[PDB]
């Protein structure tokens with residue numbers, strides 16, 4: 001997250017931290033995700049496509065820090081890694097960038113909701129907020145494009161939804177953006193998602209309800225003028241989600 005503010009898991013208790021084990025046993029951070037039910041985390045396919053083996057991954061819920069444990073956190077293995085059959089990647093864009101992880105603990109349990117662990121509602125179908133609505137993004141991704149490290153503390157920021165017609169401009173992304181994607185950015189291009197934020201939540205208040213409107217997917221650079229963050233439009237994938245859960 002470029003700009004924005006530090007936060008803790010209580011302010012985004014559906015946030016899932018996804019890591020991968022290496023050969024030799026080192027564990028590194030991969031991507032964010034969102035808990036949509038006790039046993040299911042939703043994320044981005046591009047996070048896993050190069051290492052598509054479920055046994056390589058670890059999921060934490062209730063975690064506010066990257067490389068130190070948070071009190072009350074839960075750790076899960078991945079019982080099921082479901083990538084979207086229609087995924088593709090062009091130079092920049094990723095299409096159908098959506099993935100489901102079924103989580104199971106070593107004791108065989110799903111998520112127990114607590115103060116630090118809660119589910120996020122999915123939107124009703126084809127129902128998103130109007131352009132210019134302020135939504136929030138959360139993640140452990142880079143604080144600056146030039147950074148070598150990820151932040152140790154969880155971050156969040158606010159971005160405003162951009163219209164398809166506007167994001168369609170050649171100055172913006174041309175035809176790289178489809179109706180299955182959403183664009184969002186700061187009016188000053190001052191704050192944004194970045195590398196390491198992929199798979200995490202774009203949350204909007206719709207109908208008085210905090211709703212998983214998007215999943216961090218791609219962008220050109222981070223917090224660059226005319227280059228918004230691009231998000232998987234969750235409201236266009238409900239059958240896929242419903243069928244696979």
Ligand SMILES: N=C(N)NC(=O)c1nc(-c2cc3c(F)cccc3o2)c(N2CCCCCC2)nc1N
Nearest residue numbers: 145193194195198217218219220221222223228229
């Ligand atoms: N909001 C947005 N402008 N960009 C995003 O959301 C974003 N950016 C990036 C991204 C671009 C980029 C860059 F030009 C210089 C330094 C760091 C960068 O990080 C990114 N990367 C992970 C995945 C593919 C591989 C590229 C890296 N993933 C993203 N989701």
